[PDB]
Amino acid sequence: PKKTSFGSLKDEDRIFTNLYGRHDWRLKGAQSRGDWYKTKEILLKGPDWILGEVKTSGLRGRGGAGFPTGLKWSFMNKPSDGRPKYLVVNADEGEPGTCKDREIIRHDPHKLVEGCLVGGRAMGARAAYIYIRGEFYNEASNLQVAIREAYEAGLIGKNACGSGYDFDVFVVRGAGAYICGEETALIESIEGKQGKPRLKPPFPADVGVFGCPTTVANVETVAVSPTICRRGGAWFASFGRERNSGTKLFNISGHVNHPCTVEEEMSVPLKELIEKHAGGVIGGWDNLLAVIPGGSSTPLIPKSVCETVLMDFDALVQAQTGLGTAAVIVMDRSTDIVKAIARLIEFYKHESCGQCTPCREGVDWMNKVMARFVKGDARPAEIDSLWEISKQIEGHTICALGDGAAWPVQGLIRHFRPELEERMQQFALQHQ
Amino acid sequence: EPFDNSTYRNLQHHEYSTYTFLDLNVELSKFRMPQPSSGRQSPRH
Amino acid sequence: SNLIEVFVDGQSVMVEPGTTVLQACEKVGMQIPRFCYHERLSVAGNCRMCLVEIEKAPKVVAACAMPVMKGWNILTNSEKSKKAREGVMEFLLANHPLDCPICDQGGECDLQDQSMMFGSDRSRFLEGKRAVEDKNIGPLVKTIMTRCIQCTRCIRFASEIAGVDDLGTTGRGNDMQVGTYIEKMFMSELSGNIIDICPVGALTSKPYAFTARPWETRKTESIDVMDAVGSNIVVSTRTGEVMRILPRMHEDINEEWISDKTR
Amino acid sequence: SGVNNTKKWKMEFDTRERWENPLMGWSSTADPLSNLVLTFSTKEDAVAFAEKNGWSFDVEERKVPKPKSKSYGANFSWNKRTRVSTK
Amino acid sequence: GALFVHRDTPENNPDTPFDFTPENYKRIEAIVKNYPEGHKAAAVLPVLDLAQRQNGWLPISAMNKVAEILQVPPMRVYEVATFYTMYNRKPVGKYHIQVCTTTPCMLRNSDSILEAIQKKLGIKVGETTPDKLFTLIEVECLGACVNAPMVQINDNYYEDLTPKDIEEIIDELKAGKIPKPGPRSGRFSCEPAGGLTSLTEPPKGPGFGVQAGL
Ligand SMILES: Cc1cc2nc3c(=O)[nH]c(=O)nc-3n(C[C@H](O)[C@H](O)[C@H](O)COP(=O)(O)O)c2cc1C
Ligand code: SF4
Ligand code: SF4
Ligand code: SF4
Ligand code: FES
Ligand code: FES
Ligand SMILES: [K+]
Known about the structure:
part of a larger assembly, 5 chains, B: little secondary structure, E: alpha/beta, 5-stranded mixed beta sheet, 7 helices, 5 strands, flat, binds flavin mononucleotide, binds iron/sulfur cluster, binds FE2/S2 (inorganic) cluster, binds potassium ion, NADH-ubiquinone oxidoreductase 75 kDa subunit, mitochondrial (chain C)
């Protein structure tokens, strides 16, 4: 029953069998994979069925939220209040290491839009407002032709999949930012506003956009919904461990021989990921000094921690990090860890929206003191201060970017403390 | 028809014009339901 | 009736549902430190100084936009609440320019006063401060934008209270420049009141600039005569003459704003 | 924004003639009672002071804050104009 | 360029003659149609891109002309333009280079690609060629970090880029020929350099795992 020797995803187990664009990525190959089939029947079965199936599915927050999507998609499932309900696909993908949504938009967006309509049955929405990243210009047009064939065929729009459903799907290309990645700042970008996180409550669920309720979901979570309700959520629940239910499009990157976004069997030791599917990393296991586990926000872990940990939400949490978007970036002895997170935290300073004081001021302050840390211009107690202000901005921000900035530096402090001391110590004698 | 392993079938992303996104957006209007009315046509109004 | 019951740091107090954490605090006499919220000017929630930890909470709640429900003890003087206050206040003060002896807000500055009560007593900064280029939106109000803390209280005032959309916060990140981007001119009949709402010396009255200080100026209560509205105002007198005119609190007549001519 | 001044009562007087000193421009004043303000918890103790000293009398009631029903969802409305134009 | 205050220049002035072509009003009316009536400020974001796709940049006239055609105050138009990255308010030189520099990119030596662009093209970061060809600006992740170092030419983005690989990309782009966007190595979109791992057996047929009526 419990497949503890856990790994080796199958092509049928791969929700999207066209992630590389290998076969026909367009609508002509969509129905070949199994897409746009039996959607007429389920849409008639009522929202509770998909809610029931997703309960068995175990879909959790794949956009870094780490929350059961079944609860969230049913969170706002209330009778009509007159204000139309809406859907949003968080296709921002601004994290340095997030690529799977870029692949799914470019190659299999028919699963995405169908997931919107089969999802839109659950929240009882009248239209979707997917937020394609502006940098994904040709991927935006890629889903437009998916939009084109799906609309006139009756699959989406009026009589959604011929089920008496007026659910639609709109497209909004961005103009460049990470802060639009978070839903509470995404909606302002949708709502003709500069991307600034919105304070909750009010939640997006009861009121998302233009004073109207709107459900926000990660790109894969909505895109995997049609398959998990077609073949069966329990089969998809057979993947992942407890509260890790399912499989994840891992994003292999860094100093790895063959960097990849494979939809690969989930809750798996990173050793199996890097060697079996990524063709090893450069120099081998001994070469890699540390690994960014699942995203830039997620604190990186060294070989001393990642020697046995499986890439699952529960094990990642107790590993003082998170799986997030499975953005696994492997990093070796040759490169300096301080320089590695230097560019990350510099990027974070280049993406704070400045709305709340802790993120606007703290991240910039972090950038300056850390830039000294690259050379080593500090004293022993500055790491403790860098510890201190990290906790100060951890959770005190309006949005989760501030503590999203706390975690990477926090993990760097706790793990390679002697490295900071010696590099800082080297700073002193060379500049004596 | 046979399953491939070294063929990319997304050549359209190279051959997208400068207005291609807008060139598909313009005629998307025919599949449009009556948009919801907020009781007015702007909050300042 | 429907007034929901809730505790504040102990003692329980009933309150109308939908009331935020602040609005329940002053019912017992608690004025939680705030920078971006004005009782008659929208709700911003960006200053994060109102952050007070609540009982059982794993995260400090933003008291401005948090509706309270049954039995939520407001841990006002709790350690982590004061810890959140200490961190957020030094963050606001980080890039602030050392202008107190030359800033007219000296002696009546909210950033100055709260740092005495809810603030540290030494600095941990070891870097260079941010410098924002000044603007010019009138000969009636000065603009020293480096002193700004981006509480956005000015832009909201223009949007609703003044009814004119000419103010905003251009930029990204630490480059949160609040102003008009293009060269513009903040002529509204209620323009002079953005001086009072600003908690810092970011905007100050040019006519009053460098003429007096808050401690020396004696205050007297009188009325406005420049208009038939007859606004209640307080007159500043020092050394035997008048320097600056401030609106008074009168919800029926003037609320707390006065016309530019009166100011 | 702090309000730890609108909680007490005072004993202010009426300002009298203030003429500049001929030499160096002072505020030479012959009002001995000008620079005295007292503090009273309530006003009935404050009025009692007026009776015992028999001074001329007028009062002003506290300007209590009318309770402003604030909200954050109103800044993002669907029909009401309370939607904010900037955040 | 790092100037969030607008200086009234003779070239970029409110009197600059900006407008739209017959097709563009059809484009913007499609943008405003996509959103419910009553709240049409959402159309501000795409209409700015329309000016991006016509003028190649945003003059102050373009933002001001957007204001009344969207029934929105001009300052809100400025706020949308100033925040977002490629809503460039200053004129750019046609080929608009975004070398990707964030931590995943620099870990696999994006500096060599940056250096190759630095020396061969001859201009520094954020600058432009003497006669309006290229503009190299360091950019963060655009959302494809799986591949090798990256550079976004206009709307055509490129990956699997070695320091040499961008050198013939910039060679042929100098002559005016646009290289094929996408990964340049044997990687097509996201499969291993050493032979693909997944996508081996044919995909399942239309409809699987029927739950009775379903
Ligand atoms: C700084 C930041 C960036 C984010 N970026 C993304 C993103 O690119 N894509 C995404 O799906 N969610 C992103 N999120 C998470 C969203 O806020 C939101 O929780 C998520 O879309 C929920 O997805 P779900 O409903 O499928 O769980 C981001 C959050 C933060 C704080
Ligand atoms: S943490 Fe605060 S300042 Fe940073 S992006 Fe979020 S809301 Fe804006
Ligand atoms: S705003 Fe306040 S703290 Fe800052 S210089 Fe002026 S008086 Fe001093
Ligand atoms: S200028 Fe003054 S009122 Fe405006 S945001 Fe800054 S501190 Fe607030
Ligand atoms: S009062 Fe809550 S942030 Fe200013
Ligand atoms: S890492 Fe180069 S695209 Fe994000
Ligand atoms: K002020």
